[PDB]
């Protein structure tokens, strides 16, 4: 058909693609929301490592002594460390739910306290638990990686 007619059509198509794309990114954003409720592993490690370096081998979190949160809370107040119970709790969750931490939970593996003492050994029941959580965590991770790529 005419030229002004074609130029207006091509401009509409271009606007469509650009509105469509912006639409799926907004959708990916909303879907990703639930997967970003906890701090990232790097953020979690950086929250705890400065105060309790014994809990880390380099940047890698060691398996944590049972009930250690209560000890960390006590230490935060004695040292007047700027860290709320909530932020402590969230960083610990990000760590114990990471693939690396879950992979380390094998029968006979050691849990450590802040001074480097072994407090418990991982049981067969904890190993079964970890393998199953790992199965779901990886699925969640693949979903958020895909969604993030939509955004990138």
Tab-separated table of C-alpha atoms in Angstrom, residues 7-149:
chain	number	residue	atom	x	y	z
A	7	UNK	CA	6.224	3.587	7.696
A	8	UNK	CA	3.378	3.855	10.217
A	9	UNK	CA	2.900	0.078	10.146
A	10	UNK	CA	6.604	-0.644	10.674
A	11	UNK	CA	6.690	1.867	13.539
A	12	UNK	CA	3.726	0.130	15.166
A	13	UNK	CA	5.345	-3.295	14.884
A	14	UNK	CA	8.552	-1.932	16.417
A	15	UNK	CA	6.523	-0.419	19.253
A	16	UNK	CA	4.801	-3.771	19.770
A	17	UNK	CA	8.030	-5.766	20.126
A	18	UNK	CA	9.362	-3.134	22.515
A	19	UNK	CA	6.170	-3.186	24.576
A	20	UNK	CA	6.111	-6.982	24.530
A	21	UNK	CA	9.698	-7.298	25.703
A	22	UNK	CA	9.115	-4.749	28.462
A	23	UNK	CA	6.100	-6.851	29.396
A	24	UNK	CA	7.939	-10.130	29.836
A	25	UNK	CA	10.750	-8.480	31.795
A	26	UNK	CA	8.168	-6.994	34.161
A	27	UNK	CA	6.667	-10.483	34.432
A	28	UNK	CA	10.061	-12.045	35.116
A	29	UNK	CA	10.606	-9.375	37.767
A	30	UNK	CA	7.421	-10.220	39.656
A	31	UNK	CA	8.127	-13.969	39.471
A	32	UNK	CA	11.687	-13.463	40.699
A	33	UNK	CA	10.480	-11.506	43.714
A	34	UNK	CA	9.965	-14.542	45.968
A	35	UNK	CA	13.485	-15.855	45.196
A	36	UNK	CA	15.106	-12.612	46.395
A	37	UNK	CA	13.662	-12.594	49.932
A	38	UNK	CA	16.961	-13.690	51.473
A	39	UNK	CA	20.401	-12.046	51.105
A	40	UNK	CA	22.772	-13.516	48.512
A	41	UNK	CA	25.365	-16.046	49.700
A	42	UNK	CA	28.181	-13.512	49.190
A	43	UNK	CA	26.235	-10.980	51.235
A	44	UNK	CA	25.559	-13.544	53.972
A	45	UNK	CA	29.205	-14.567	54.189
A	46	UNK	CA	30.242	-10.927	54.390
A	47	UNK	CA	27.747	-10.406	57.206
A	48	UNK	CA	29.181	-13.127	59.432
A	49	UNK	CA	32.827	-13.637	58.426
A	50	UNK	CA	34.221	-10.360	59.886
A	51	UNK	CA	32.922	-11.252	63.354
A	52	UNK	CA	33.302	-15.045	63.343
A	53	UNK	CA	36.108	-15.897	60.872
A	54	UNK	CA	36.422	-19.350	62.435
A	55	UNK	CA	33.129	-20.242	60.803
A	56	UNK	CA	34.708	-19.904	57.362
A	57	UNK	CA	37.408	-21.630	55.351
A	58	UNK	CA	38.327	-18.774	53.037
A	59	UNK	CA	34.975	-17.697	51.603
A	60	UNK	CA	33.464	-21.142	52.220
A	61	UNK	CA	31.039	-21.540	55.144
A	62	UNK	CA	31.835	-24.450	57.475
A	63	UNK	CA	28.961	-26.615	58.740
A	64	UNK	CA	27.552	-24.786	61.800
A	65	UNK	CA	27.392	-26.067	65.386
A	66	UNK	CA	23.834	-26.823	66.460
A	67	UNK	CA	22.341	-23.883	68.408
A	68	UNK	CA	25.164	-21.564	67.398
A	69	UNK	CA	22.799	-18.636	66.698
A	70	UNK	CA	22.275	-18.224	70.440
A	71	UNK	CA	26.073	-17.964	70.933
A	72	UNK	CA	26.431	-15.457	68.093
A	73	UNK	CA	23.643	-13.292	69.612
A	74	UNK	CA	25.467	-13.239	72.957
A	75	UNK	CA	28.719	-12.277	71.228
A	76	UNK	CA	27.051	-9.483	69.184
A	77	UNK	CA	25.915	-7.719	72.379
A	78	UNK	CA	29.201	-8.247	74.293
A	79	UNK	CA	31.135	-6.806	71.336
A	80	UNK	CA	28.441	-4.235	70.467
A	81	UNK	CA	28.438	-5.519	66.883
A	82	UNK	CA	26.001	-3.691	64.558
A	83	UNK	CA	23.894	-6.728	63.647
A	84	UNK	CA	20.225	-7.351	64.398
A	85	UNK	CA	18.743	-10.738	65.232
A	86	UNK	CA	16.790	-10.555	61.996
A	87	UNK	CA	19.797	-9.867	59.753
A	88	UNK	CA	21.795	-12.565	61.560
A	89	UNK	CA	18.975	-15.072	61.071
A	90	UNK	CA	18.623	-14.183	57.366
A	91	UNK	CA	22.356	-14.493	56.648
A	92	UNK	CA	22.487	-17.885	58.392
A	93	UNK	CA	19.513	-19.094	56.320
A	94	UNK	CA	21.161	-17.993	53.072
A	95	UNK	CA	24.250	-19.970	54.113
A	96	UNK	CA	22.563	-23.202	55.230
A	97	UNK	CA	20.423	-23.280	52.095
A	98	UNK	CA	23.315	-22.829	49.666
A	99	UNK	CA	24.224	-25.772	47.420
A	100	UNK	CA	27.783	-25.902	48.739
A	101	UNK	CA	26.678	-26.113	52.384
A	102	UNK	CA	24.103	-28.832	51.587
A	103	UNK	CA	26.678	-30.805	49.553
A	104	UNK	CA	29.000	-30.718	52.592
A	105	UNK	CA	26.380	-32.404	54.798
A	106	UNK	CA	27.635	-35.985	54.510
A	107	UNK	CA	27.527	-38.579	57.318
A	108	UNK	CA	30.534	-38.166	59.580
A	109	UNK	CA	31.242	-34.554	58.514
A	110	UNK	CA	32.015	-32.027	61.273
A	111	UNK	CA	30.007	-29.082	62.557
A	112	UNK	CA	32.144	-26.251	64.084
A	113	UNK	CA	31.658	-23.483	66.657
A	114	UNK	CA	33.330	-20.059	66.428
A	115	UNK	CA	36.517	-21.169	68.199
A	116	UNK	CA	37.098	-23.978	65.701
A	117	UNK	CA	35.945	-26.843	67.957
A	118	UNK	CA	34.006	-29.746	66.371
A	119	UNK	CA	30.676	-29.846	68.194
A	120	UNK	CA	28.827	-32.634	66.352
A	121	UNK	CA	29.184	-35.035	63.439
A	122	UNK	CA	26.531	-35.060	60.668
A	123	UNK	CA	24.169	-38.059	60.999
A	124	UNK	CA	22.789	-40.373	58.318
A	125	UNK	CA	19.408	-38.672	58.833
A	126	UNK	CA	20.890	-35.212	58.264
A	127	UNK	CA	22.655	-36.474	55.133
A	128	UNK	CA	19.329	-37.780	53.702
A	129	UNK	CA	17.686	-34.485	54.622
A	130	UNK	CA	20.451	-32.487	52.920
A	131	UNK	CA	20.376	-34.507	49.691
A	132	UNK	CA	16.628	-33.900	49.391
A	133	UNK	CA	16.837	-30.152	50.162
A	134	UNK	CA	19.661	-29.892	47.606
A	135	UNK	CA	17.354	-31.461	45.029
A	136	UNK	CA	14.804	-28.681	45.511
A	137	UNK	CA	17.341	-25.832	46.003
A	138	UNK	CA	18.920	-26.604	42.616
A	139	UNK	CA	15.528	-26.445	40.926
A	140	UNK	CA	14.861	-23.102	42.550
A	141	UNK	CA	18.278	-21.928	41.488
A	142	UNK	CA	17.745	-22.904	37.863
A	143	UNK	CA	14.423	-21.071	37.852
A	144	UNK	CA	15.889	-17.847	39.201
A	145	UNK	CA	18.901	-18.004	36.845
A	146	UNK	CA	16.535	-18.304	33.864
A	147	UNK	CA	14.385	-15.442	35.095
A	148	UNK	CA	17.468	-13.310	35.697
A	149	UNK	CA	18.621	-13.966	32.126
